[PDB]
Amino acid sequence: AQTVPYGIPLIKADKVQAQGFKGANVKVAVLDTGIQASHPDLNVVGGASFVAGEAYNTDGNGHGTHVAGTVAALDNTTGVLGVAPSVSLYAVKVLNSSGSGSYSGIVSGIEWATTNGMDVINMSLGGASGSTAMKQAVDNAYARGVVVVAAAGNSGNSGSTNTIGYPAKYDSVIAVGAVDSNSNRASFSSVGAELEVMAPGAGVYSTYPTNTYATLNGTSMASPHVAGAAALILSKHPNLSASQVRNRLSSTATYLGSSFYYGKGLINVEAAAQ
Numbered sequence: 001a002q003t004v005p006y007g008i009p010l011i012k013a014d015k016v017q018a019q020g021f022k023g024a025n026v027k028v029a030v031l032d033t034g035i036q037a038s039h040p041d042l043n044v045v046g047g048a049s050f051v052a053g054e055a056y057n058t059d060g061n062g063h064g065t066h067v068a069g070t071v072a073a074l075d076n077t078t079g080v081l082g083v084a085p086s087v088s089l090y091a092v093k094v095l096n097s098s099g100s101g102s103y104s105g106i107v108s109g110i111e112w113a114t115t116n117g118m119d120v121i122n123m124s125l126g127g128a129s130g131s132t133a134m135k136q137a138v139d140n141a142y143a144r145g146v147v148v149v150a151a152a153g154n155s156g157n158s159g160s161t162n163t164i165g166y167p168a169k170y171d172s173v174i175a176v177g178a179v180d181s182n183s184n185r186a187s188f189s190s191v192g193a194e195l196e197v198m199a200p201g202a203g204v205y206s207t208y209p210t211n212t213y214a215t216l217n218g219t220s221m222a223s224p225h226v227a228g229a230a231a232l233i234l235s236k237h238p239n240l241s242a243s244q245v246r247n248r249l250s251s252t253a254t255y256l257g258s259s260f261y262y263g264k265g266l267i268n269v270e271a272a273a274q
């Protein structure tokens, strides 16, 4: 039968789905290692590959498939259940099968997503430095009305040190940190001024190649929860701007402690989408 990963009720995504809001006709671009499009529990409707040698609809890593499932694993009698199981899923391959990419591949993915009318961009990736063109791509995506989400990073804490990665660090992008099933910050989750919200990131079960289901840890698992939560809000309030969707997720989060470690806290999509 269908497992419901603990992150689904924890952000109260299940309460919004029961009101009948599932992210239908919201278009979500997963910028990642691609997506195993043939997986029985995912529907990939389009996409693009900026990675030499690999088509957008295959995933030799597993990472993009797993991130896609947390957004949009189908609601049926099998597998897992995504935060927004009715979204239009786009696989935008910007990371190779070894799990990494170039700044220009990522930049091209962002631009593809903005040019093609995506409503939400998820980036479960991060680097220490970013680039001038990455900044402009995220800025333009945001100013054009796309909700842009990225993993804060798995660099943990070390004293006063900001350890937030790029692109999460750009103020156009929502930086998502990671909690576990007890709503406590996972140790690997990056900290700093830019941290905006927490979502589930330790012990996250999702779709994984070939045709199976797997548990991973990372702020990468946290980000798609926030990307799916944005899609839920938009399916319920279709005329909100990106600023508005972002402000709702933010301002209604469950406070958990110091914003340095938790941002505004754990997203609550029931409160956000009301």
Ligand SMILES: [Ca+2]
Pocket (backbone or CB within 6 Å): 002, 041, 073, 074, 075, 076, 077, 078, 079, 080, 081
């Ligand atoms: Ca399913």
Ligand SMILES: [Cl-]
Pocket (backbone or CB within 6 Å): 098, 099
């Ligand atoms: Cl690797």
Ligand SMILES: [Cl-]
Pocket (backbone or CB within 6 Å): 156, 157, 158, 159
């Ligand atoms: Cl530490």
Ligand SMILES: [Cl-]
Pocket (backbone or CB within 6 Å): 169, 170, 171, 194
């Ligand atoms: Cl900044």
Ligand SMILES: [Cl-]
Pocket (backbone or CB within 6 Å): 183, 184, 185, 256, 257
């Ligand atoms: Cl806590």
Ligand SMILES: [Cl-]
Pocket (backbone or CB within 6 Å): 193, 194
């Ligand atoms: Cl801030």
Ligand SMILES: [Cl-]
Pocket (backbone or CB within 6 Å): 239, 240, 241
């Ligand atoms: Cl508006």
Ligand SMILES: [Cs+]
Pocket (backbone or CB within 6 Å): 037, 038, 039, 040, 041, 042, 043, 044
């Ligand atoms: Cs499929």
Ligand SMILES: [Cs+]
Pocket (backbone or CB within 6 Å): 046, 047, 048
């Ligand atoms: Cs295509």
Ligand SMILES: [Cs+]
Pocket (backbone or CB within 6 Å): 060, 061, 097, 098
């Ligand atoms: Cs691999």
Ligand SMILES: [Cs+]
Pocket (backbone or CB within 6 Å): 001, 002, 003, 078, 079, 080
């Ligand atoms: Cs299952």
Ligand SMILES: [Cs+]
Pocket (backbone or CB within 6 Å): 142, 143, 144, 145, 242, 243
């Ligand atoms: Cs905006």
Ligand SMILES: [Cs+]
Pocket (backbone or CB within 6 Å): 155, 156, 157, 158
């Ligand atoms: Cs650390």
Ligand SMILES: [Cs+]
Pocket (backbone or CB within 6 Å): 158, 159, 160, 161
């Ligand atoms: Cs330090």
Ligand SMILES: [Cs+]
Pocket (backbone or CB within 6 Å): 192, 193, 194, 195, 196, 259, 260, 261, 263
């Ligand atoms: Cs913060």
Ligand SMILES: [Cs+]
Pocket (backbone or CB within 6 Å): 145, 238, 239, 240, 241, 242
């Ligand atoms: Cs909108």
